[PDB]
Amino acid sequence: GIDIRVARPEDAEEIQIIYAPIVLNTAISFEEAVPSVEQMRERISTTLQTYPYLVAVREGRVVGYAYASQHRARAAYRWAVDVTVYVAEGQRRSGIARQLYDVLLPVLKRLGYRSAYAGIALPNEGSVGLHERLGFQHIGTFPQVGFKLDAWHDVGYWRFDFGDEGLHPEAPLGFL
Amino acid sequence: GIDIRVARPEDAEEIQIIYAPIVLNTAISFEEAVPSVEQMRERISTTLQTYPYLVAVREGRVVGYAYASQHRARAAYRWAVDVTVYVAEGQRRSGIARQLYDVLLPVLKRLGYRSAYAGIALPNEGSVGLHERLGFQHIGTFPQVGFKLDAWHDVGYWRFDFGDGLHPEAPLGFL
């Protein structure tokens, strides 16, 4: 049925299992080392101190997650946000990914952010099309910018526009 | 006479005087408050312990400078570097900018870097010229991504290529 909720440091194990083959076997993440539960736990709670972090469950088991993160480091940038959506290594397609974004994106819009950015490791025709369907506009590509698993990978960036005027500080997310 | 050399923490004073207007009056940097000299001093040292940091002197005074910094945090981004060049306002469109690069790019090449990116705030004909007329390729723009001095600013990224085994990158000497 794929129900959706805010993640908590308890799901850290299940998330860390979704992440393992993504790090070890793919170029979706550029992390070259699988993180531990102890630090996976930390990331969840550290994210939730400012950004949302969502989990998808099926039959009482996490089969995908999605989170928001800082785009760049200075204050002039605090209305851009980086969105990350991962799904299980078996059944999701897109799929669970679109259900995740359809919750995550609105929250973001309602928090005060102006543009959401997603970086895809090309080639990725599937994820590419999903973002375009959602209404992400392709804004550029950093070619050969990353070397993981004995290969150079082009990384394209898609932008989601929220729309606004006047300006005022983006707002956080509800506690645990 | 335009002598180019590696920077030293003594340069912090004349570097602040160049950077500050940029901070105050432009979107060239998105930093909004001016760092102290003692702060600038630390950035020079901290940069130099891995990346090249250069300065351009003329008649004894610094009139420009340049550095490189990490592009993105993770390991796979090891071979990518960002490049940054600032000249004094009274030397805009004088040539120090390009001369600064001609030292800097080769250094990066022989350090083992694969590509170099410069982020340009975008109402800048002068800057885009220098980069494109230096072999940089425009690879994309991040529209209205940043807000400073009561205005949203577009930011476009230009890329310089070196060539292509994949052995890890290498640092810079102290003194």
Numbering used by the authors:
A (entry chain A): 4 to 179
B (entry chain B): 4 to 167, 169 to 179
Which statements did the authors publish about this structure?
The arsN1 gene encodes an N-acetyltransferase that confers resistance to arsinothricin with high selectivity over the related antibiotic phosphinothricin. Here we show that ArsN1 acetylates both AST and PPT but with higher affinity for AST, indicating that ArsN1 is an AST-selective N-acetyltransferase. The overall conformation is a three-layer α/β sandwich fold, a typical GCN5-related N-acetyltransferase fold. PpArsN1 forms an asymmetric homodimer in solution, as shown by the extensive interactions of the subunits and size-exclusion chromatography, similar to related N-acetyltransferases.
To elucidate the mechanism of PpArsN1 resistance and its selectivity for AST, we solved the structure of apo- and substrate-bound PpArsN1. Arg75a in Chain A of the apo-structure also shows two conformations. One superimposes with the L-AST-bound PpArsN1 structure, covering the substrate-binding channel, whereas the other moves out of channel. The side chain of Arg77b in Chain B also appears to cover and move away from the substrate-binding site, allowing substrate access to the active site. The two conformations of this residue in L-PPT-bound PpArsN1, for both PPT-1 and PPT-2, are quite similar to those in L-AST-bound PpArsN1. Arg75 and Arg77 from each subunit appear to form gates that controls substrate access to both catalytic sites.
